[PDB]
Amino acid sequence: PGIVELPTLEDLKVQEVKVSSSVLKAAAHHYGAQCDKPNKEFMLCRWEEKDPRRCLE
């Protein structure tokens, strides 16, 4: 009953970090505090917009 709109694969070709899990967790404390501003903006969209497709940017 309608379009299940999915974004094209073009916008999904984003630079993904290539580091093992321990690398993330080792610097986790020094990562969350100093990169909070985009983290909180993205996650606020996740809970507010409630739709994955809205927070692609």
């Binding site: 996650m43 809970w47 409630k50 739709d51 994955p52």
Partner: protein, 63 residues
């Protein structure tokens, strides 16, 4: 006593019975009517209150 007492009193008896008779017929019709449609005070079968909903943010964004 005079026939007037019986005459007027019987008219009151008729008036009471006529009003009661038409109300019972209205009772059957209304009860049938609002049982089906349901936009009436009685026959409102129980539902679940919206108060018992947790509106706080969950552990997953998609909710």
């Amino acid at each position: 006593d005079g026939p007037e007492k019986n005459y007027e009193k019987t008219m009151a008896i008729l008036q009471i019975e006529a009003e009661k008779a038409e109300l019972r017929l209205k009772e059957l019709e209304v009860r049938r009517l609002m049982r089906a449609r349901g936009d009436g005070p009685w026959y409102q079968y129980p539902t679940i209150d919206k108060a018992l909903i947790d509106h706080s943010p969950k552990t997953t964004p998609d909710n």
